[PDB]
Write a protein that binds this ligand. Sequence first.
Ligand code: VJX
Lengths: 257, 256
Amino acid sequence: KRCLFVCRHGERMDVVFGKYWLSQCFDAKGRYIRTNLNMPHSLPQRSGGFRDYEKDAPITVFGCMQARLVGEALLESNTIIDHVYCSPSLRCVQTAHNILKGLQQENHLKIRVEPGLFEWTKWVAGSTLPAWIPPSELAAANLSVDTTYRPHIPISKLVVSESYDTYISRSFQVTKEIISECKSKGNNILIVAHASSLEACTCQLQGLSPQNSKDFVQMVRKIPYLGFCSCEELGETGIWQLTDPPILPLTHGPTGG
Amino acid sequence: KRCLFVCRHGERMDVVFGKYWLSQCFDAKGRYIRTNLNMPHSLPQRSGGFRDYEKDAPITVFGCMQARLVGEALLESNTIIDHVYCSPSLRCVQTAHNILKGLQQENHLKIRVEPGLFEWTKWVAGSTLPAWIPPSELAAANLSVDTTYRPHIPISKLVVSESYDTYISRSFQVTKEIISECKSKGNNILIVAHASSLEACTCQLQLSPQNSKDFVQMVRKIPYLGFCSCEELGETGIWQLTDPPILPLTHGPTGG
Ligand SMILES: O=C(N[C@@H](Cc1cc(=O)[nH]c2ccccc12)C(=O)O)c1ccc(Cl)cc1
């Protein structure tokens, strides 16, 4: 077969509890005090204190469970994952790790943190990139990250508020580089990143021309949490095609009220 | 203090997947075939076939997690639940069970199924009540129900398309009958019912029950596993609302 799977990260803390979520779970002294059961028991310590979460928020408890279930669904369908890459966004690393937990592969597979899979940098606030936890420190928080992996696009080569074309171009360049270095090692590749990744990583893989920016944004906003798409290589053509994913979709509603 | 905990059931299968949800997860021959990871691995075989679900829908996978977490939160607060009662709706009994799982008390405790705790019957479709699974059949699905339990208001004594006055009374009466029999047994009692139940059961145990229009508004504002706490003001017999012993639970949808 040989497949490439691209899925979106889990439910975001800064979506459910809004842009001022740190207000609701950190006190004056900076102690994490959860005020909701959807908040995790504890948050990992960061190199810049809790304010590094403002532009790089973690997934919720239900975000972990979405990720666990997709992993459990891959195992149940005997869908073997040989390689896993993720965006350097904390929400993506956490999703990837929780998929490995559901996959029962926490202690075998080591996640390849690729900054080239970070979403369109136009969607970052201010004139500074997020303070992404380095692989070495993600590993030191139990998250099953490969600290050996050489990134195709380092953090230093990412542009602040890049053009649509810059984002689409690097998304394509990095996906071919990912595919190229996994030609030898294994069949199936899982990418855990953003809504934008599912289209930007696959669009030009099929030989097709990319969408215009406004069509792209509309496609991207219809992709749910842990939204999962699939690409099979057509023979040895080098072109890949989208296919019915190996697992069922995942749809739940809100808490309500 | 001596507490009464009233909480709504978990996420409904028939809300997420619509009114035609049996169309999506049952084929010609009545074989359950899930089409989404939020649908459970399997559904219990029902007395009168699969069509009995049409009016008594089960909670989703994420429905069970909502319940589990509420249960786990009760455990962590050092809150010992001494007696647990619930509506005869499958969603309510499934919620009740997953709270006991969350409490690590599936074996120790047994759920008291009370038809008197069922929601306002005006919200029933057709001219017939839902074909509820009897406490005997529920315990045969590994759901930790108390087959012993003598219901204060049995099914046969429930009126189809009842009035707002009849509901608040039967909700008030059953709550007192629940408080009465527990007096000695333990301290804290847990009701597991519907969005209506949280108001109807603790309104006049504290006040004049609100009008029908004001009620419906308050009900639709209560989330899945929404949780309120009442405590007896001494031995006076007048109970009052209090900041619950556990945090609330808020999550968004799948989206798109
Ligand atoms: O929903 C957010 N992000 C999106 C990407 C995204 C980001 C953006 O700025 N504008 C957009 C417009 C159209 C489409 C997508 C975007 C994602 O998760 O895929 C999001 C971002 C910040 C916070 Cl505090 C909370 C939530």
